[PDB]
């Protein structure tokens, strides 16, 4: 029962013939240090013997990336940040954002950004940071988390992290294969998603990096939210079945007598995010800018989106992430009628996070704040000083702060008596337990060289290709007079546009003209082509935005913001009457807090999302004439295109739905021959699909229209469009498939 142990600075002692390691280096085994009590007596037993700044060293979690030495010329090195952090602030939790990759030859070390790192380098950097840890007084270990890692970028062997489709491709594989076994589409195969979640814990473990930001939860009820990008699917019941799969494979399905879990077995602790569910943005505007702070439920539906948080809370998941958004008008659940949770962010709502998912939803683990948030995007509280939004979030049941890497400040709080010792303690309890029962205080190291032989394993990436090509959905198939369009005929001339390679074509056994030319030089005619095959897709360019400038965020001639959040001090937000401009809502013009010259926090848009008054156009025809969103390749070029074939359906057009775009009639996409919703493939998933040698199986996880009406007109918490004039071009479960 002895389990393996591993101190590369601390001592092992033995007692009872039995081993342990000596993090606090007394000569004797302190109950934390034993293995063997349970471990609310360990933690218990540690939290006894630490000073408030190591306590309150727990609640902060930031950046910690490796670095580069450019005249060591070696990848994987501490950076300078790492022994502040460790052995000052008393950090214990980390994000890893560098790239896990093969450098190609002639990569130099320049001492600048984020370098790309080998998974060998990036096991050997977590080594060191545990080293570190280990060398603290109580050699409390680390823990690491990342944003997702195993997944294909749309717009982009061995060494990598194995690559899948996007999460919604994972939600279309899914219910196409329940679909193929059963002939519906509603809950899907989860085996699919454990399949999936079997190479990612794999391959994250194997470096060290065992905790997530994610995966997301959030449902995608509204199209015009710019992170539908990053959600499963619209259908709570799916998402929910989506969460508990993950929660079981990437946590282990041992729960611990406290409901979590967290177990040696761990590969990956989740931390759920969005929660209650970040999905129903009003207008589809976002949070983390002022004019979108709103979240608005039409249709009542705010208990279905925190449904997928409570089938992961119920299977045990280790931490929950909550949103910068504000309810408006939300029933307080479990509680007396005409009540409704304050106007105020949850991530600063003491009755969402603590009543609602530890006193309702029944969540016994710790609560992990997003990035740029507190600061600066406390919403319902711009009056308040900065410290004081710090304690609404701790307060509120928040117990560790990302981005956060001065200890000082959770001190200066407790000293202001605005934070409690009790707090500060109840917090340490909740996030040392993870890091006992994951085993990381008898074993927090990795070998680099098993890292080398799992991340990007042949038998793993051959998993992420098989969803791949089940993730993609056929939307149209015309029947012609000489029969199926799709099923692709041995032999022709292909043209090809967007963002297909043109060899990787060619090596399927056709002769390809090749329409993407540079903008100056003169583009072939796709006249007389038997197939034309298009890969498109939309994205924003909202980089000029400025909320202070009289061109853009204060221009009367974009509108007013129709979004209205009352206060419960009874007077509107700023900018958000209804009846401001739209840029009126940011600190920088309203200054209201305790700053004279306040810096802008929407400008420059920095994390997605089209120019507010335009987040309402997803049909191509308007995106190609919007100031901020961008057909890519532009429509114009597309219907020239298929203007040149006499027969448009001839064409082929393979369409990444980053949001859920309109296909409009006019854009005359919808006479092409055939459509697909792909959701990240490589091309030889692709051409395998298109050819023949795969089917297409795969069913859409969320509902897409075909007319602008629908999209402004549909309720942004509920599913689908059925509730609308026009109604849904594709329904949810809708996946045609050769017959
Ligand atoms: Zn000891
Ligand atoms: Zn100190
Ligand atoms: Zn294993
Ligand atoms: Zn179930
Ligand atoms: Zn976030
Ligand atoms: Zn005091
Ligand atoms: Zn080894
Ligand atoms: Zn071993
Ligand atoms: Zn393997
Ligand atoms: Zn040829
Ligand atoms: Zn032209
Ligand atoms: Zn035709
Ligand atoms: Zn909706």
Redesign the pocket.
């Known amino acids: 029962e002895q389990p393996e142990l591993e101190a590369r600075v601390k001592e092992i002692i033995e007692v009872d013939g039995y081993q342990f390691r000596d993090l606090n280096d007394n000569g004797e085994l302190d109950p934390y240090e034993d293995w063997r009590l349970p471990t609310p007596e360990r933690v218990a037993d540690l939290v006894g013997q630490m000073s408030l700044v190591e306590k309150s060293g727990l609640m902060l979690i930031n950046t910690l990336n490796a670095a580069c030495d450019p005249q060591t010329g070696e990848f994987g090195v501490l950076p300078a940040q790492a022994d502040n952090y460790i052995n000052t602030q008393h950090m214990h939790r980390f994000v890893f954002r560098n790239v896990v990759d093969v450098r190609a030859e002639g990569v130099e070390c320049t001492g600048t950004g984020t370098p790309v790192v080998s998974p060998a380098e990036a096991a050997t950097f977590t080594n060191a940071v545990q080293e570190m840890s280990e060398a603290t007084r109580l050699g409390i270990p680390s823990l690491f988390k990342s944003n997702a890692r195993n997944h294909i970028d749309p717009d982009a062997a061995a060494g990598a992290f194995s690559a899948f489709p996007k999460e919604a491709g994972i939600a279309a594989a899914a219910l196409g294969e329940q679909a193929r076994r059963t002939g519906e589409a509603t809950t899907g195969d989860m085996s699919v998603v454990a399949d999936f979640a079997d190479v990612m814990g794999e391959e994250w473990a194997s470096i060290g990096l065992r905790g997530m930001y994610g995966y997301m939860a959030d449902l995608s009820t509204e199209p015009r939210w710019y992170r539908t990008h990053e959600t499963f699917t619209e259908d709570a019941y799916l998402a929910a079945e989506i969460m508990e799969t993950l929660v079981q494979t990437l946590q282990g399905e041992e729960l611990t007598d406290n409901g979590l879990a967290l177990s040696p077995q761990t590969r990956v602790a989740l931390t759920l995010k969005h929660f209650p569910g970040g999905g129903p943005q009003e207008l589809g505007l976002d949070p983390h800018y002022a004019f979108g702070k709103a979240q608005v439920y039409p249709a009542g539906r705010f208990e279905e989106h925190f449904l997928p948080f409570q089938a992961a809370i119920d299977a045990g998941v280790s931490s929950i992430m909550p949103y910068y958004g504000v309810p408006v008008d939300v029933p307080v659940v479990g509680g007396e009628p005409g009540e409704t949770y304050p106007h105020t962010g949850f991530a600063f709502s003491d009755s969402i996070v603590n009543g609602l998912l530890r006193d309702q939803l029944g969540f016994t683990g710790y609560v992990n704040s997003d990035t740029g948030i507190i600061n600066d995007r406390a919403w319902g509280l711009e009056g308040n000083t900065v410290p004081e939004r710090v304690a609404a979030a701790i307060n509120g049941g928040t117990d560790t702060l990302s981005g956060f890497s001065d200890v000082s400040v959770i001190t200066d709080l407790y000293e202001a008596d605005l934070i409690s010792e009790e707090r500060i303690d109840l917090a340490a309890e909740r996030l040392l337990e993870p890091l006992f029962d994951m085993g990381l205080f008898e074993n927090p190291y990795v070998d680099p060289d098993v890292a080398t032989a799992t991340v990007g394993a042949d038998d793993h990436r051959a998993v992420g290709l098989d969803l791949q090509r089940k993730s993609l959905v056929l939307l149209q198939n015309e029947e012609t007079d000489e029969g199926p369009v799709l099923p692709l005929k041995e032999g022709g001339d292909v043209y090809i546009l967007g963002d297909f390679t043109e060899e990787t074509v060619?090596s399927y056994?056709?002769?390809v003209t090749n329409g993407n030319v540079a903008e100056g030089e003169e583009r072939p005619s796709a006249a007389g082509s038997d197939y034309v095959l298009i890969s498109m897709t939309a994205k924003t360019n909202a980089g000029d935005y400025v909320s202070d400038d009289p061109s853009l965020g204060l221009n009367p001639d974009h509108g007013t913001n129709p979004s209205v959040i009352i206060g419960d001090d009874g007077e509107p937000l700023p900018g958000l009457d209804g009846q401001s401009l739209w840029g009126a809502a940011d600190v920088c013009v309203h200054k209201e807090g305790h700053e004279e010259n306040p810096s802008c926090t929407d400008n420059r848009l920095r994390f997605g999302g089209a120019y507010p008054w335009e987040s309402s156009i997803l049909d191509f025809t308007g995106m190609e004439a919007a100031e901020s969103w961008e057909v890519v390749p532009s429509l114009e070029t597309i219907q020239e295109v298929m203007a040149e074939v006499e027969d448009p359906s001839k064409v082929i057009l393979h369409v990444y739905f980053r949001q859920p775009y309109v296909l409009d009639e006019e854009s005359g996409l919808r006479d092409a021959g055939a459509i697909l919703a792909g959701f990240g493939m490589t091309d030889t998933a692709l051409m395998d699909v298109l050819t023949g040698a795969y089917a297409p199986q795969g069913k859409l996880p969320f509902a897409l229209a075909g007319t602008r009406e629908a999209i402004i007109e549909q309720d942004s918490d509920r599913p689908g469009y059925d509730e609308t004039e026009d109604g849904a071009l594709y329904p949810f479960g809708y996946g045609l498939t050769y017959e």
């Open positions: 060619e056994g056709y002769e």
